[PDB]
Amino acid sequence: MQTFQADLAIVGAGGAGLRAAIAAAQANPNAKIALISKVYPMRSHTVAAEGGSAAVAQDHDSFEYHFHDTVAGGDWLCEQDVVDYFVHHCPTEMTQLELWGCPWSRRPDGSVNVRRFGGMKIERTWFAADKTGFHMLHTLFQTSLQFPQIQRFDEHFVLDILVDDGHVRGLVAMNMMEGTLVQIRANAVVMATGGAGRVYRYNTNGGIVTGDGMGMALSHGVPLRDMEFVQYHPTGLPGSGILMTEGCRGEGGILVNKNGYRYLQDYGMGPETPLGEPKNKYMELGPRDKVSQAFWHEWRKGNTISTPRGDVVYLDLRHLGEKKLHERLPFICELAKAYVGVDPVKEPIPVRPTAHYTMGGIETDQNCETRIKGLFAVGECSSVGLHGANRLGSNSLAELVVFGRLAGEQATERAATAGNGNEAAIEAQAAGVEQRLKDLVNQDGGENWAKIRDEMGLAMEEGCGIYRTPELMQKTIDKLAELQERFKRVRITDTSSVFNTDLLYTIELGHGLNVAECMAHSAMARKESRGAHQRLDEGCTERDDVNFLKHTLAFRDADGTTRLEYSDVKITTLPPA
Amino acid sequence: AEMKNLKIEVVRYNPEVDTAPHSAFYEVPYDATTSLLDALGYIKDNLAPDLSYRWSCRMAICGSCGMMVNNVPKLACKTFLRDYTDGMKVEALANFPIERDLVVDMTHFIESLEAIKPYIIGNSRTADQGTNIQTPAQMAKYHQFSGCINCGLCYAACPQFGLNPEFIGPAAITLAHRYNEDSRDHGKKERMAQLNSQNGVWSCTFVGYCSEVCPKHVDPAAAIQQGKVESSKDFLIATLKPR
Amino acid sequence: TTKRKPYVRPMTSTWWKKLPFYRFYMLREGTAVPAVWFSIELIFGLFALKNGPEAWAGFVDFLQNPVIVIINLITLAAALLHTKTWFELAPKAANIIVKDEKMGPEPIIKSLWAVTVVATIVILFVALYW
Amino acid sequence: MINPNPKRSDEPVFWGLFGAGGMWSAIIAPVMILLVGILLPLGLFPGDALSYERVLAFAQSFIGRVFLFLMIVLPLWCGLHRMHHAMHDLKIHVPAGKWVFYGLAAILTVVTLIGVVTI
Ligand SMILES: *Cc1cc2c(cc1C)nc1c(=O)[nH]c(=O)nc-1n2C[C@H](O)[C@H](O)[C@H](O)COP(=O)(O)OP(=O)(O)OC[C@H]1O[C@@H](n2cnc3c(N)ncnc32)[C@H](O)[C@@H]1O
Ligand SMILES: CCCCCCCCCCCCOCCOCCOCCOCCOCCOCCOCCOCCO
Ligand SMILES: CCCCCCCCCCCCOCCOCCOCCOCCOCCOCCOCCOCCO
Ligand SMILES: O=C([O-])CC(=O)C(=O)O
Ligand code: SF4
């Protein structure tokens, strides 16, 4: 293996990884930062964000208000000292992105406009247009080009990390074009790989969001926290699972059943508001979860429209007017027209709930550091303890820059005072990654990876969905267990070397099975209903602060078992009640 | 029911076996929603696991999709079989080296893109001071040109590029333009050199095909023309300064 | 050593013959020829105009060929195709904002076509009514 | 890697001319080809509007001289500019192409200039 020397290595060039690379480059102008990603930075998921990034700005707002919002929304499973740090730094980060050129939409006087998301009372979500993530990722990426300190390893699939005596020493990745392995040595490594939605049959995610980073941390004794909280977005296209921003509704859209009845009123979110004025907290602007559940309920009554791509409900936007329809929300109107073939000016959009965000992720302290010295995690793949049992809308993008900057600064420090490690041990680790890879390649069995992938998704969709029952969760646990056994009988028929996606997709699949199992076990074990986790079995239908006001820690031992442990939740000023 | 089938011709190429690219034909199920990306998936899952290609978002926003469909550069995820019942031939994005199957060397593009300093230059304002003030009016100056997803379809469309691989390209220039037009930037001079190059705006003879294909209606062509005009002003200014 | 063998597709001198859009491009640039030809012709006339009525009549006799009449008819067609296409393209050079929106090209395309019509009229008037 | 300090091109001069030229021949070339290439040789004009005497009278006027020059020259700088590039587009190797086409322009320009200061 060829070897590269770097002060810190960042795995992931998404919102978080980039913000991380820059903060590290500005912190230490002399550092040599290795930014690694399996796709060119701009193809990262972040690019697909359409709603906005939260940051306190209106005069009648207050960090307190954002703090509260965040804590309540997370059903008190938030690390309160962290949330505080978060709200206080958003304004700075969003403002900085502006300075870097991010074209945030404006008020006629030149100031940046803001809009409501996540059900917040005080609007505070900054926005590009409905292309915010595209604009943030791209501003960040481009901004990063000016710092020579950052050396990119585009299209380099990071395989495993190198750990010895509790401290990280680098990583082994594979040059995708070349097909050759590489050793990047660094006394600090920042994991910024993204979420794991892709383990679900229908999601809003991009192909690349497979949970690699999480799976990697799992192999080294690090635990994934709160993996049971998977967030579903209420309005996604059938089949594709492509997201239809909350904006549609915030503008006036309504959701109706096969009878064109705005069913949401019969679920505690009434009274119906007029086509004219949408009102936060009511109807189509009600609690996220309630809206997604209402779908299920309508489904039981047989009120959902039947379609091939599946059952759905309708997202009617006609009453906005072409100019608003076509001129204001271009993309969507284009998305809708293209993927379900429907003009939002002439007809209604079919939609249903879809797997969307991964609350869980690699456990980290308030500085984004893991139990392994020098190993940090930041971004959706982590768990700083900001979202608890339910992320707030527009808080994820914010996080990317707020904690990515921290992760960057902290990692810099941790690599400066790291000291040296056992060369023969580290090199032995690398040799191991190499060996393991060979083993997978030579593995035979005639099992099609793709079918395992498909089954995994159907399992998560049935066992870990909007409403859970011990029976089906268990069923899913059992399924995944099975699939794990099948994964070992998979044969990667492509032995080529230039851009071998057959192999890379197969590796990605593994991490997914592992990550999936931490999700399921976590859920089956949380005998309560909190945030995104909702059970229907007796004694589990309510929130239990007496027995479950804690985080779920999921560990995967060398014998392939997923064990759980629980940790306490740091309260500061907002005790639960 | 019973899904229709479509023989799709894909141009395969393995640099470890093949001396030159060669077609292959696959029968793929399809309906009024099936996209080329969908089709490629089905192939790799059931007919040919060694079929490599780039992709990600599945919604025409990331831009890794880039490829040729019946000689027209397009995005695999925004291309639908329903519109190719009389034959479909899929090849690697034109004017780029084919590395493997439908994957090409995007290096030049990246380097070009890096070459024009796509980033706010010379503004000293700092976070604690608040954000810059920029009106919608001001934003309208560069907005359209910021919607570029670096997909690469304009380079496959530009004949000038196909004839001059050293041409920095539509996208590259548009990006530069975008910053030159942002009221917040103050580094136009840092970018002109490259724009003034023979390999810059001047390599373009306004064929216009680029804008025809931009899956995000950025209109690179318009950016390049405006570019020439600025280059032109730069050339004058530089002339009326002796020495 | 690398197992990568980058295949580079060559570009023939007949690339534009494939796709129409390119063809139309070649056609647009093609207008250049008739255009200079005409400039040439004007030179002939200009100098014949000076070598007296004798030579000028010899010129006029040339324009009456009539194969030169066909060529000139082709020259007028080409010239118009040029005007057609030029006006479309010219507006793409201006970046004008009219109330928070980037306008054109229609407003400009219209103006140019108006100027041309008026010019075509004033010229025909001047050259023939007197 | 892309040259970090490329050489400035001189295209802005030729583009410049070609621009004014293209605009002149777009607005004024149609009518002129009508008069000179069709109306004149077909007598399709009232009385002696396009008779040697009258044309000559025009040509010799100041405005007539200027107009004559521009009507000839501007178009040339445009079209020759275009054929120069067409060469490249066609992949036709032309030695000192720049000098050729643009030189042809200058020569003709001059020639034209002599003629309008009148032979
Ligand atoms: C799916 C989605 C999410 C989303 C949204 C709309 C959609 C369709 N809209 C949002 C919104 O309006 N406001 C907001 O607060 N959040 C919104 N989200 C969620 C949020 O955007 C995402 O959670 C966020 O994008 C996460 O970004 P992050 O910086 O954490 O990273 P990433 O974009 O997911 O990218 C991952 C990077 O890691 C690399 N990678 C992954 N595995 C590997 C391996 N094995 N080797 C090398 N590199 C790897 C990828 O290449 C990528 O760069
Ligand atoms: C009747 C006026 C003709 C003037 C002739 C003077 C020619 C002088 C040429 C000198 C050009 C110098 O370039 C100066 C710009 O600063 C950069 C210096 O480094 C060198 C760059 O490359 C040189 C650019 O000029 C190239 C060619 O110019 C040719 C002129 O063609 C014009 C013909 O006019 C006829 C129109 O009706
Ligand atoms: C009467 C015929 C005169 C011909 C005029 C032709 C002018 C065309 C100029 C085109 C110049 C093109 O440059 C070509 C070289 O390849 C390099 C390209 O990169 C740019 C380099 O800088 C350009 C150098 O050319 C400068 C032109 O100087 C003008 C010539 O003056 C000639 C005077 O002849 C009269 C003496 O008897
Ligand atoms: O994406 C949206 O429009 C709303 C949302 O819940 C998120 O920010 O993930
Ligand atoms: S200008 Fe359009 S075709 Fe070109 S890379 Fe950008 S998005 Fe793609």
Ligand code: F3S
């Ligand atoms: S097609 Fe190429 S020629 Fe110019 S107008 Fe577009 S970059």
Ligand code: FES
């Ligand atoms: S998969 Fe993202 S542009 Fe098509």
